[PDB]
Symmetry: D2
Subunit: 30 residues, 4 copies
Amino acid sequence: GELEALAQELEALAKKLKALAWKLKALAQG
Amino acid sequence: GELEALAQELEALAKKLKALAWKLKALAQG
Amino acid sequence: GELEALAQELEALAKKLKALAWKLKALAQG
Amino acid sequence: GELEALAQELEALAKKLKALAWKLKALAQG
């Protein structure tokens, strides 16, 4: 129900955080 | 340097968020 | 400028995580 | 029980994310 919806949103947020990490990695190289 | 150290911290936090997401999915089913 | 923009993205994401945690507590309590 | 504890973990992780965002802002200006 709602708890499964919230779990899928959290996974989406985790994926987003990983993307932001690698954007920072990208900026860090040059 | 400092930015790569920080990017590493964000990577680890993203991995922790995924762990939490999967714990939530387990709860949504249990 | 890009570093500051990335930081604002991290803040936006943290805000969503806090909002999600509130919803988890609401569901657990009710 | 478990859901409340996970929500607390998520709130702690959001705070750690805000900390890294402020560290990024400091580096962007430092």
